[PDB]
Amino acid sequence: LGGPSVFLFPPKPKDTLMISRTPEVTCVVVDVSHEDPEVKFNWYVDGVEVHNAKTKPREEQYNSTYRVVSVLTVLHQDWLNGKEYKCKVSNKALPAPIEKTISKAKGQPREPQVYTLPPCRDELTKNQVSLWCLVKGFYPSDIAVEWESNGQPENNYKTTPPVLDSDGSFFLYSKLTVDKSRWQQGNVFSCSVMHEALHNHYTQKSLSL
Amino acid sequence: LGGPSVFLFPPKPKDTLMISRTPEVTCVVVDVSHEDPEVKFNWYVDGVEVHNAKTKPREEQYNSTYRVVSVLTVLHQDWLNGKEYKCKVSNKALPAPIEKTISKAKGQPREPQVYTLPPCRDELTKNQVSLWCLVKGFYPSDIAVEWESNGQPENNYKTTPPVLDSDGSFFLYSKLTVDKSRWQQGNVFSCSVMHEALHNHYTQKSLSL
Ligand SMILES: *[C@@H]1O[C@H](CO[C@@H]2O[C@@H](C)[C@@H](O)[C@@H](O)[C@@H]2O)[C@@H](O[C@@H]2O[C@H](CO)[C@@H](O[C@@H]3O[C@H](CO[C@@H]4O[C@H](CO)[C@@H](O)[C@H](O)[C@@H]4O[C@@H]4O[C@H](CO)[C@@H](O[C@@H]5O[C@H](CO)[C@H](O)[C@H](O)[C@H]5O)[C@H](O)[C@H]4NC(C)=O)[C@@H](O)[C@H](O[C@@H]4O[C@H](CO)[C@@H](O)[C@H](O)[C@@H]4O[C@@H]4O[C@H](CO)[C@@H](O)[C@H](O)[C@H]4NC(C)=O)[C@@H]3O)[C@H](O)[C@H]2NC(C)=O)[C@H](O)[C@H]1NC(C)=O
Ligand SMILES: *[C@@H]1O[C@H](CO[C@@H]2O[C@@H](C)[C@@H](O)[C@@H](O)[C@@H]2O)[C@@H](O[C@@H]2O[C@H](CO)[C@@H](O[C@@H]3O[C@H](CO[C@@H]4O[C@H](CO)[C@@H](O)[C@H](O)[C@@H]4O[C@@H]4O[C@H](CO)[C@@H](O[C@@H]5O[C@H](CO)[C@H](O)[C@H](O)[C@H]5O)[C@H](O)[C@H]4NC(C)=O)[C@@H](O)[C@H](O[C@@H]4O[C@H](CO)[C@@H](O)[C@H](O)[C@@H]4O[C@@H]4O[C@H](CO)[C@@H](O)[C@H](O)[C@H]4NC(C)=O)[C@@H]3O)[C@H](O)[C@H]2NC(C)=O)[C@H](O)[C@H]1NC(C)=O
């Protein structure tokens, strides 16, 4: 052995930005022994102990240790407000409890600029065309970009991960591919962007023929 | 112990596409023991044994095994022609020699389309502007994208890794950032792209005010 290790993970960006999703912080304890398998978790939100976390059943691993996980749902507004979530792990194999703390990225937020680009000339002779959504100058990097048309999700797009720019902000592109048909008939397509620094955390940019 | 393991690595895309660079295949042998440290390499180019590989001095590792590496330079035209490079590793701890073979990606090549985009409206009021180079529909993914102006490299750009598209081809974008000055005075900037499927393996797209 050697004592357990603790890793603390943030919620997913899309869960923090959507009212219908459940953002969670996850405190993962590994190298928990057969002899001392009991793990106690204490959770604090800016120092105030909360009691509504849920510990998953211990999971035996291939190397003969346990993985013990505790999951705390965070209020969407608390995460966005920069509250700090501390997981304290107690176990009889540890010399003292281990604490980890996480919170949203801390720099000044910066709102994305969003532009849509119509299909490149070479594609007007093909069966499918691509529309582009350029999203740049945002911070932090947490963001969600989708496409829709007639209020339905389009699913055929691919978005780069955010890329760190020299000025400390991020940029990305998303590319939607649609049947040329749909474009030539004047259907309106929109790039949706959800990011904390936008007004109302959301913006859309629309285009058509 | 358990016997040595072999990993074979391709040359870098930029080395294969530039006449002044040295593309190499690298045969890496790990978990070589103190007792049987001697490693013999045989190399073959489409079955023909070649004798100009160079074995690096054995390198002792932190876990008390050796890492032994052999490096074979490949002719630029041979790699592009799809020749297969086989590394055969013999060592007294192995039941039989181990062989690995690698070659360029095998699908049909497909030439990139390249477009440059001038600065977004929001930036005309800033100190720096970004120019964009969109490169799409290429295959294989090996490619090199740079920027220049007045025949000198511009170094302030960032290029995404190739992204796999639904149609089996790749796309990427490169973004150069320059002082607004330079753009407003009419300097010409160009996106260079080197890819095997372009005519003469190279193309440039240029833009200015
Ligand atoms: C016995 O086995 C145990 C189990 O191992 C597995 O079993 C076998 C089969 C074998 O295959 C193993 O390889 C298997 O993993 C071993 O446990 C492992 O221990 C090691 C450490 O020793 C852990 O390593 C750490 O890994 C994290 C990476 O976090 C994960 O991603 C990995 C790899 O992709 C994945 O395996 C993990 O499970 C984690 O996945 C994430 O899980 C979270 C939580 O569940 C997901 O988030 C949640 O998802 C939900 C939806 O699913 C909701 O959205 C919810 O809201 C959300 O919270 C998340 O999606 C998921 N991610 C992915 C990709 O799946 C590394 O980050 C960690 O990093 C390092 O820390 C190091 C110290 O170890 C340091 O060296 C490194 O540089 C690095 O970075 C620094 O770390 C510091 C912390 O010390 C940081 O402070 C610092 O900021 C940071 N620096 C920088 C610059 O960033 C480390 O590598 C590994 O996770 C354990 N595996 C598991 C499954 O738990 C055990 O080791 C072994 N024991 C023995 C004795 O052999
Ligand atoms: C004792 O120690 C040894 C040394 O370990 C280090 O020491 C300590 C300090 C500790 O920190 C270790 O963690 C250290 O690494 C151990 O050796 C390691 O063994 C493991 C396997 O057990 C190796 O793991 C493999 O790793 C490759 C990844 O290849 C590397 O990238 C890694 C990580 O980024 C890097 O560490 C390596 O050095 C390799 O780097 C590349 O090196 C090449 C060659 O030098 C560079 O190319 C050259 O570069 C030149 C310029 O520099 C020129 O350009 C030249 O032209 C060019 O050729 C290259 O740039 C560089 N890349 C990077 C990023 O640096 C994995 O690919 C490999 O993959 C897997 O294979 C698995 C089986 O193991 C399989 O499970 C996986 O899924 C995976 O994928 C599949 O693999 C199949 C092969 O089996 C493939 O057929 C299949 O296609 C593929 N599938 C798919 C879908 O893709 C595997 O993980 C590791 O490389 C070794 N480390 C080193 C340094 O050599 C040793 O294990 C340990 N022993 C014991 C008993 O403990």
Domain of residue B122 covers 104-209
Ranges of beta strands (E only) in chain A are 5-9, 24-32, 40-45, 48-50, 54-55, 59-60, 66-73, 85-90, 98-102, 113-117, 128-138, 144-149, 152-153, 157-159, 163-164, 170-179, 189-194, 202-207
Q: What is the CATH number of the domain that holds B203?
A: 2.60.40.10
The 8 Å CB, 24+ separation contacts for A113-117 are A113/A137, A113/B120, A113/B122, A114/A191, A114/A193, A114/A203, A114/A205, A115/A205, A115/B120, A116/A189, A116/A190, A116/A191, A116/A205, A116/A206, A116/A207, A117/B117
The answer to whether A103 and A81 are in contact (CB under 8 A) is no
The structure tokens 């050796």 sit at B66
What secondary structure does DSSP assign to chain B, as a single string?
A: ----EEEEEPPPHHHHH-TTS--EEEEEEEEE-SSS---EEEEEETTEEE---EEPPPEE-TTS-EEEEEEEE--HHHHHTT--EEEEEE-TTSSS-EEEEE-S--SPPBPPEEEEE---GGGGGSSEEEEEEEEEEEBSS--EEEEEETTEE---EEEPPPEE-TTS-EEEEEEEEEEHHHHHTT--EEEEEE-TTSGGGEEEEEE--
Residue A149 CB contacts under 8 Å (≥ 6 apart), including other chains: A182, A187, A188, A189, A190
Residue B141 sits in the same domain as residue B93: no
What is the rounded distance in angstroms from the CA atom of residue A150 to the CA atom of residue A177? Answer: 16
Nearest CA to ligand 2 atom 26: B7
Nearest CA to ligand 1 atom 95: A7
In the three-class reduction of DSSP (H, G, I as helix; E, B as strand; rest coil), residue A139 is classed as strand
Resolution in A: 1.8
Residue A94 sits in the same domain as residue A113: no
Under 8 Å CB pairs connecting chains A and B tally to 39
Spatial strand order in the sheet of B98-102:
B48-50, B40-45, B85-90, B98-102
What is the rounded distance in angstroms from the CA atom of residue B61 to the CA atom of residue A95? Answer: 32
Separation in Å, CA B40 to CA B44, B69, B91, B97? 14, 10, 7, 9
Cis peptide before A140 (omega within 30 of 0): yes
> CB atoms < 10 A from the CB of A24, how many?
18
Residue B108 sits in the same domain as residue B209: yes
Structure tokens at A99: 């604490």
Residue A206 sits in the same domain as residue A115: yes
Residue A19 sits in the same domain as residue A75: yes
The structure tokens 């993970």 sit at A9
For residue A120, the chain B residue with the least C-alpha distance is B115
What is the rounded distance in angstroms from the CA atom of residue B156 to the CA atom of residue B129? Answer: 11
Residue A47 CB contacts under 8 Å (≥ 6 apart), including other chains: A86
Residue B181 sits in the same domain as residue B196: yes
Whether ligand 1 lies within 6 angstroms of the CB of A12 is answered as yes
CB contact under 8 A, B158 and A166: yes
Residue B110 sits in the same domain as residue B205: yes
CA of A8 to the centre of ligand 1 (A): 9
HSE, CB side, 13 Å, CA atoms: give it for residue A11.
24
Structure tokens at B110: 């497909």
Residue B61 sits in the same domain as residue B113: no
